[PDB]
Amino acid sequence: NALQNMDYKDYLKMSAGNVSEYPGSPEVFLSEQDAVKAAIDIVGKLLTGLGVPFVGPIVSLYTQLIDILWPSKQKSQWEIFMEQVEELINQKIAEYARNKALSELEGLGNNYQLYLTALEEWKENPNGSRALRDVRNRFEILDSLFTQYMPSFRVTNFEVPFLTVYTMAANLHLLLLRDASIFGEEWGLSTSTINNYYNRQMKLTAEYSDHCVKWYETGLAKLKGSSAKQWIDYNQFRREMTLTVLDVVALFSNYDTRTYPLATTAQLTREVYTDPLGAVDVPNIGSWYDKAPSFSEIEKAAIRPPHEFDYITGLTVYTKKRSFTSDRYMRYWAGHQISYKTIGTSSTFTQMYGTNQNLQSTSNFDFTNYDIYKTLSNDAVLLDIVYPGYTYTFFGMPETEFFMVNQLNNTRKTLTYKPASKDIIDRTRDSELELPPETSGQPNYESYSHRLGHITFIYSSSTSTYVPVFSWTHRSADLTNTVKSGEITQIPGGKSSYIGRNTYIIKGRGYTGGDLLALTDRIGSCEFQMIFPESQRFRIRIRYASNETSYISLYGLNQSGTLKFNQTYSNKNENDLTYNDFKYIEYPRVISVNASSNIQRLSIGIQTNTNLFILDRIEFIPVDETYEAETDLEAAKKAVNALFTNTKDGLQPGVTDYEVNQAANLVECLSDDLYPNEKRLLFDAVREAKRLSEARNLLQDPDFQEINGENGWTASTGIEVIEGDAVFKGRYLRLPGAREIDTETYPTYLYQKVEEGVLKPYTRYRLRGFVGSSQGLEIYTIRHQTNRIVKNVPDDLLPDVPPVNNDGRINRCSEQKYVNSRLEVENRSGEAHEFSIPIDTGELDYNENAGIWVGFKITDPEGYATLGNLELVEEGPLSGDALERLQKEEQQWKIQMTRRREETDRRYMASKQAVDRLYADYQDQQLNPNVEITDLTAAQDLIQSIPYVYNEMFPEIPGMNYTKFTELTDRLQQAWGLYDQRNAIPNGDYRNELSNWNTTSGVNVQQINHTSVLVIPNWNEQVSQKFTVQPNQRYVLRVTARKEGVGNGYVSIRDGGNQSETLTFSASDYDTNGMYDTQASNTNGYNTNSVYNDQTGYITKTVTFIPYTNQMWIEISETEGTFYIESVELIVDVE
Template sequence: GFDAATINSRYNDLTRLIGNYTDYAVRWYNTGLERVWGPDSRDWVRYNQFRRELTLTVLDIVALFSNYDSRRYPIRTVSQLTREIYTNPVLENFDGSFRGMAQRIEQNIRQPHLMDILNSITIYTDVHRGFNYWSGHQITASPVGFSGPEFAFPLFGNAGNAAPPVLVSLTGLGIFRTLSSPLYRRIILGSGPNNQELFVLDGTEFSFASLTTNLPSTIYRQRGTVDSLDVIPPQDNSVPPRAGFSHRLSHVTMLSQAAGAVYTLRAPTFSWQHRSAEFNNIIPSSQITQIPLTKSTNLGSGTSVVKGPGFTGGDILRRTSPGQISTLRVNITAPLSQRYRVRIRYASTTNLQFHTSIDGRPINQGNFSATMSSGSNLQSGSFRTVGFTTPFNFSNGSSVFTLSAHVFNSGNEVYIDRIEFVPAEVTFEAEYDLERAQKAVNELFTSSNQIGLKTDVTDYHIDQVSNLVECLSDEFCLDEKQELSEKVKHAKRLSDERNLLQDPNFRGINRQLDRGWRGSTDITIQGGDDVFKENYVTLLGTFDECYPTYLYQKIDESKLKAYTRYQLRGYIEDSQDLEIYLIRYNAKH
């Protein structure tokens, strides 16, 4: 296997490249969106297709990159994608019929919001010259975890009364498929401008997801042929689509347009959410559970939901002043004796203090540093995952978790992506590395106050401890790493003070006649590597006994203390026929 230095080097490469590839993917995704944007409906169709397909094939994968940090996530880790994707408004000839409408269509997309659970859709019907169509609808929803009262959205479109309303109620795991029937009619009212076009939807079948059984679908008027599974396929084709589905319907808006006697347009637009965003914020005992904070029940006053940077799997929360960020209803499936640690993934332009509580009971409080400068864009490196060392347990199977940010000046920006609940017994490699480094540093000194260095500690030993400290994760324990680095530097100073040799780090040979190292001309000085942190020398072999390769240094007798024993120590990586002498009064030792 690899030695510790190589393993740490590879790990540092991994964490660095996770950030590099994340930013690369998001940058080219945004570049592509800008390139395909245009003013007409056909341009929006192309834009939406690019957004949807690149979300499925690129951004959803990028959102999981951080989980490949095996030291931070050493056990099964469950992520949730709360972002939404959109199928096109269900219309005939939509991709080429409407000029200058791209911006109008995009405004129909729901703005960043907390996740909610679609409970029902009440669909209204209107009639135009004998043609019935979907004229409007009303949606009811609940907060995640069904932790609050059901709420209704404003009416989309208009409440036609040409037929009784059709109620589509949530069943099973939600709606995983729609089969829609668009209707286009050109109505001849006479000649010239009196001709009118009708772009509407006259039927949709809603199919419900279930892992165990087929559930009866709900049909508004009639089943159509425009299948949502054609553009949002299942994630598992080895089982029926009702069980292998990848997305469920999360919202429906209405694109409405009427141009006098020219045309009438009513087009429902379906929003879809990934199935990983489960309804109840369940926290088991056998995994690390990541919960996006857009699954919160309530936002604190002053907290807003903003568009995510592309690599978070959804939108994020933002605060610009101290206060409560949000409350989150969680449901515990583990025994209440199970203990957890909480971690927060955040970005901030300021140092701040996070507070957490459960059911009003304070749990953790800690100070954390700024991660980005004011005015900079959110990138992978802007976010940091931090945790609290004190574990806790839940008192109730259904609990309210509250996160707050304090001790910073208003006007700064604090972004929260997600929180993580980690079983307390999980041993993290990063924690183990920190404990090992702390122990190694403490063992350099004779006491806890670091006044004296142990007699058996060599420069090489200090260098190896320094390598341990340098390999610690900046993201996990930056403050502890800086503190340990200062202690190692202090140990190095103490070692230099007691060392009678001059220039122990081989800065030069034959530089001064009366001091430092003297040696033959074929000696080379090389920079530090994984074995030697400081400079080291290479003495080439020779076949001439009269002119050997040599290196020496004289120590003034006055520097030696009476009744004191001295040791000559060093580290040799490899040698053959090497001889080392200490000569005093012409006697070799």
């Protein structure tokens, strides 16, 4: 039945089994198909040998490439590649340049065929200089031929005509240089010569990619028009040049043998569109596009916007009938609903196309578990002539056969749409003319290159346009996202799954073999669903682009964590990306999956900082069981080595104490079982490094063991020392916020002085440390000038996901791996965790002994900081601009000090004399009898007026005059001590508040001018004391007081007998009688007065007294107003 009209060639291509007919024209007729046939075969063979570094497969590959590109047939395959593009864009390449290129490419052929033999010779005798000289030399020859010839395939004004040639040539050149890096050392080639081949490969891979994309776009943009006819030509260029150019360009990055050192599977996820299913150039009738929608309307209708990868599961076709008379009618595809889905997910999607109004019938097709590898359609016309002689035409699609192969068990099946028509003009359309299979010894149901993906539709009621359009996906894109053990598996971002969320997909340009997944603030995550049929360990690698540096996070496959990505491009729209804008990042965590038939899920997200991240593809790379252990050894040997000078017995100057700790933590990652000796020697190294750090640190007590001790740190109350905690190894400080109590705030402070004796002249020092986190942390350096910076450091070094678990213990290896991924960000801003502050010396002075103070302070109640790894180190001598700057600072300070010593000496000498005059002797051991409370307060006022006692910016720290202030204060307190001892009235100056006094409830002691005074606020209040004295000697009672307001203040003393004295105080104790107008003394016309200058201080009054008993009473009271008592003293009279 199928056998009778069949050719002998078709019968032999059938074989093992029974198939149908499959009538195709491979190579014959139009040679756009012969070009497309060749591109499809070439791309198909390249796909089975990406990454593979083995001689037999490579030899075998080159064999098939050469048989395609240089057949023994009549016409050159290159000329056909020219005819292909020239006939699409209606432009011939000029004669002289056309004939030159062909001549050079015939020559390339000869040389390539000489390259092949020398390659097969080396796969027999691989050891010695026989087939080794041939091949290494035939290689060199081809490199120079490509260098000389590539410009020949991009003659200006003819870049598009030549595009398929340029691309096929460029492909071979990159393929050739790949041979150098795989068979490099084996062909006896220097390490340095490979690098120059490799570097060029990478340079060329960009230049050749960027060229092909750029001229694809130009080419395509030239074919934009406004008619349906012009659209067909546009889409034909788009389809054919995708197969023939972009599909090849997509492969170029896989020829990088250092990025891809073993077998790799790539996936082409782009869709392509066969020509619309309508009749064209029916003789004497025309074409479906004669009367049809515009270019824009068709592009809108027929072509899908970028979407997640999908496949077809079901179809419902709506059928209508056209009939101008009976005896002649068409039933035709008027519309459809198509069902489809993304990988994994069991969510079904439906779209409707065309019309479903006024139907004859409906046909349903189920496609689940089947690929459609071929369609046979009918492009049809209904012609009828109605009275009185008009002609009417109608174009529709009345029949399709869909050829199907089962995905699971390889069974084959046909479904047919064929409603009843009568007396139409038919022509069949075979998809295999546009998307042929690969040429194998195997039938098209094994070797098919594409499968039916979707069905769109061109509809207009006005023009009676009803035209299906079929879209197709490439075989290399699987429907399961299977990840195999033996290989690097690539999964493009387009193959992510629909989970109910929106998602943003950017159209690709050709570089990636499909469209690009983007993550943005508005739609921040994506999910992959994958089958792992084998247990295996993988590392994950991501190919991406971004305009910013930030972090992605990964969750699934039994883990979760975070990966920094770096800016790859700048100042570009995300649709103008070129080859070199894409880079790779490597997730350091090895991942272990168990074999399963069920889907396993990896979701990728961005932080809430991040604005843009563009995902090309994720990659799974097989790693072996010891890979984790090996790479931890390398990382630790590197970090430890970086601490030391070349002799290995000193620290590098710019290595911090924090970095020594970091390295020590990484050493702990090493396997005890695999690498015992290495771990032991790397620990000896870091311990020594740590001893060197401490030896060069000029700060005392760097491990915080002696806070507030003699020579070390001075610290405010509330500062905590913490041991055995996250982030810091060993001990560190937590500084709390400033303490608020009512109207007072008390700042947190920490400081130390480094003495002039350990320093050097004209030398730069560095204060360094590590801040875990902070808010309002003020850092001070003091020598001559005071400098302050403020550091606010985020709390970003702890993971948010708690990963400690039941295993509550700290693991320094994993902790330091996380922290390192966060210091990576190259800050030196105020926000960075490290800090390093210069402090410069000029000349040293041992007398003045300024030294260097380093200080920390928090004045904010909401402030805090964690602080560790503090050091002050010598960097070295000052030169150049640093030295000029310092000499200016020093000069300015010398001149300013001179004015400050002038001011100090006035105030100091007046303070010194006021204290000296208090004593009789000169060992401050005896008070003068005359000193009264007013001599003591006068002294205090003067001592308080000495300037520059404390540093102006950091008052807790001593200033230049501190020693002077303290000396005098001690001598004053001594004298005040003696005053209290001499006074027979206990607590007569109220320095112990109200001790020893009987008072009513309203009486109080106020501090006025830094001294204690008793206040009697109302007349019903009183004070008294009984105390013992030595009787029958003479005392003097001295009272210093002030009476305000109406009435009198009284101080009464009595003994136990008949002796009694009263002193009286009133407001009238001030009254002065004036001068009497300068007692009129002047002559000749001047009679000025004065300003009778009156103030308000205390009055001192005295009385003598001889007690005749050993008990005395003193009583203090008033009749009205307010009474202030500064002191009552009773002393032995030596007058």
